[PDB]
Design a protein around this nucleic acid. Sequence first.
RNA 1: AAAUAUGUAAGAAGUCCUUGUUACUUAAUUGAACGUGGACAUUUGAAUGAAGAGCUUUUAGUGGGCCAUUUUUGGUAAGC
RNA 2: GGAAUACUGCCAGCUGGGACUGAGGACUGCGACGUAAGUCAAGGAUGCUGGCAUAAUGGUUAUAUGCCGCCCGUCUUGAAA
RNA 3: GAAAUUGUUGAAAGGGAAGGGCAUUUGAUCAGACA
Lengths: 58, 159, 172, 51, 185, 222
Amino acid sequence: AKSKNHTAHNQTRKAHRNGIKKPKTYKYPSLKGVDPKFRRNHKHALHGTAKALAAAKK
Amino acid sequence: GKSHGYRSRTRYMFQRDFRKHGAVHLSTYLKVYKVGDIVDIKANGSIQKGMPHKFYQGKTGVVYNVTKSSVGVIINKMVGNRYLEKRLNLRVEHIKHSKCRQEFLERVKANAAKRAEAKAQGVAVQLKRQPAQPRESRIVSTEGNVPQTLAPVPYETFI
Amino acid sequence: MAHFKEYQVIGRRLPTESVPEPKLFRMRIFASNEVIAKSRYWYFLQKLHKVKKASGEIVSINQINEAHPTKVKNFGVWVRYDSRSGTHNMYKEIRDVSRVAAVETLYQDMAARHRARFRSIHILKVAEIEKTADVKRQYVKQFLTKDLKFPLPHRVQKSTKTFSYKRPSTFY
Amino acid sequence: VLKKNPLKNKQVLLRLNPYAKVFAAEKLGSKKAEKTGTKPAAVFTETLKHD
Amino acid sequence: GIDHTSKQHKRSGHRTAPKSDNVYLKLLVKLYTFLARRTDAPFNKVVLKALFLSKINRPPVSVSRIARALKQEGAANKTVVVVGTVTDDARIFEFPKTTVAALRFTAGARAKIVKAGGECITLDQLAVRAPKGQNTLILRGPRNSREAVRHFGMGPHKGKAPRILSTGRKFERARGRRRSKGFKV
Amino acid sequence: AEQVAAERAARKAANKEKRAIILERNAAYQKEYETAERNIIQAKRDAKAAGSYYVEAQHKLVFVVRIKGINKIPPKPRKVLQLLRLTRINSGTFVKVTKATLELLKLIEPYVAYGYPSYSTIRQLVYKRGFGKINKQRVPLSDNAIIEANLGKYGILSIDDLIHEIITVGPHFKQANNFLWPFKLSNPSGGWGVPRKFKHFIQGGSFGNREEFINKLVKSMN
RNA sequence: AAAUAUGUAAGAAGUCCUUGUUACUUAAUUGAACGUGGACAUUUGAAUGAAGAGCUUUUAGUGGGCCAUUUUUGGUAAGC
RNA sequence: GGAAUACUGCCAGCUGGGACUGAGGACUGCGACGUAAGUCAAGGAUGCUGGCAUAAUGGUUAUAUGCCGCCCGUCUUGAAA
RNA sequence: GAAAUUGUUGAAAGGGAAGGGCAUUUGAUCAGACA
Ligand SMILES: [K+]
Ligand SMILES: [Mg+2]
Ligand SMILES: [Mg+2]
Ligand SMILES: [Mg+2]
Ligand SMILES: [Mg+2]
Ligand SMILES: [Mg+2]
Ligand SMILES: [Mg+2]
Ligand SMILES: [Mg+2]
Ligand SMILES: [Mg+2]
Ligand SMILES: [Mg+2]
Ligand SMILES: [Mg+2]
Ligand SMILES: [Mg+2]
């Protein structure tokens, strides 16, 4: 006995029962994947402006 | 059997246009991309390095990284009951700025000027775009323009 | 389609900055109402000129009453229509009191004799024949003879009651 | 507890819309219109009765 | 028929009442239902909801966690409120005066608060002193600290802990967690 | 606590002053319609008298009724019918006309009938079947206190201002129309006037834009 | 080189000024990325809609399908 | 040149007949009408009259008449088979 | 001393099954409610 092999019937109906939702934008994305040479500097950059505001607000 | 290679079905897609083969023009390389910019993807066929997969042809994302000869674009791709968030590393031939965002930016300067001028003028603004409203009345003259009477024509073969 | 009326319609593209004041085209339609009459106009302007209801505008839609409602005339109606096979032309001959009545018979007649529907017919030109002896057809010409008299044999009598007591006669 | 209709029931009409009291008094619904005798131009009548 | 957009006869998915059959808990709920209606300030809505929460959603608030909330600027003299248990700590060698209001105290936490000249108050005495909820500071224990949520969301490249009884090598450290044994995850 | 004839007189005296405002407004809105309608009929004769042709301002208002029932709808018209609040048969609501909204109606031609409503038709709908939205709750519009409380913010303090705002298509249309729960009409007391509903009006049907004949249709279903 | 179907944008997580932070970048405190301080508010920037928006845990049945309009490959065709 | 009548539309114009329904339970409100005391068709029915007080109405059961009604359980895309 | 199954007595129906659903006629039978 042979089967029925493939279809996509009812697959688009199933999909919309629960939305098809977007993945939520965030203020501040991850620096995973970003140029290492740039990050290396940006770490040291904020340490300075925090210490500048810490010494300012003392 | 079946065949699902990385560039299958791309006979006419990565083709090079008619009378536009050969070297890419220098204004392609002299354009400066920054983190945040919107860009449309369109794969040049001559440059084999840094190429996108056939899916991202015609998609438009945001930049997130910039490095020696490439940019990081970030696209949304749909799969099932969901959208995943996908990170590309394309060379700069296969990319160009979205002119829809550049249209928007210029309107922001227009609207800020209207509000700045409205305060100096004296109250009221109304700065939203209204869609095409239904048209008003008019008196169409017959002065040197009398109506031309028409009727349906009979069938002739001419073959 | 329905009990007809006659309408006048006029329209003239939309106006533009490069070319203000277009040309005004006009037609005479037969319909049951204005809404069908406006539609027929745009149907017949699309068969001739480079226009549609998106690009166009209607200017004036006016009813045309009959000039002499109670006077007998002899109309000559041209018509173009689709059969199952090809698409032909004709010249029928109608006799009535008004133009709108002649069009109301012509549609009823083409449906009986040819199985031509409303969709499949274009009334090209209804024209009143002023003079006598300008009548090619025979079935209108019989009635144009002088001192015309004819009986109505076999008279029937629609009853209210189911049964009847007498037994009926067909005299007149 | 029970929705009464204006249009009919003249009280629940007058609960709303107090002008309905004076609308009836001065009739209005059958206002006599002024009557000028303007004539259509020579072109309009010609273009109407045409081929 | 209607073309229904949403689900019909959907319950709200919120506890209207405590699942407990505790007698004295219901009398606190019978009090704060009255205050939350006939007052105004949202303090009484928040305290009411907290009385319905399950054990897992009312973690214990340490006596140190109260002290670190009072080190804040301005919040020296505010009557701290906790809808749950309050626990002692042996990692602090000083502790301020203050007045705590809660469902429960441990023998050690009550002893540590009174030794520092303070006062432990029940939630019905809090309502009498502060009816609209004034000069108050609500605190909540750390929910995700619980061990059960280590395991939630276990998959590949997730960093989430397997469900496992015995540990040590030869208990899930070979083919799956390293290059040398096939692949890493 | 006196109350009985202290607090009571003040609010009677206060609510007496609202009718004064409601009278002159309706008297003003009464002369606005008729003089506007006279000039539209005058302008037609002046152009005829001179030579020209007058063409009216197009309609900025249509009344739409769902003709088809629930079953067997493709997912694009079915979505629009929900965005125009037409989720059951013989339900209907007003629409402001732009290009955004015409291109909607074109998608739903075969399942609805619509056209250009009059004063009288609106007057009868809003009186007979006038309901409003309050915390969802479909509340009947049997008094003005109900409308002031909800729609005072945007102007509008009596039931005729609601009709005026709908008919002229004012500034606060969106607020005033969305207030009105979609109209639950009956089937038409004279029948549909055709053998088969589901063709276009132009082919002896019901659906699509029948222009000014919607009034006769609505007046029976209401 | 259509029609139908398809990606992105239409603002506060935003726009403009002011001059700080750096081991990155520049011939050059120039740029770059995140900032302090100040200016801009409910016409806050197309329509229509919104029995709320979002998140977590856990577990059942199912994994033989068939039909209809339009597009269609195999086949002379088929309730294939 | 002066009238009339249809056709389409409007009236917060007038008025006659028929059918079904009468939820609710001191008071509270919006209003009308009156110079005032009051009155009202105004947040859902009151008034009057008769006959019967028992198998008279009502319930159950058997039959009769009109139209409807395949044998359950099962596996299956599909069972009255 | 239940049911399947059976006998006698009493009521009923019955032109190639019987049984069921909605409504009423008719026949048998029934409490309540009336103070
Ligand atoms: K027995
Ligand atoms: Mg299978
Ligand atoms: Mg296979
Ligand atoms: Mg290579
Ligand atoms: Mg009838
Ligand atoms: Mg029919
Ligand atoms: Mg399987
Ligand atoms: Mg098969
Ligand atoms: Mg049968
Ligand atoms: Mg089988
Ligand atoms: Mg079976
Ligand atoms: Mg015995």
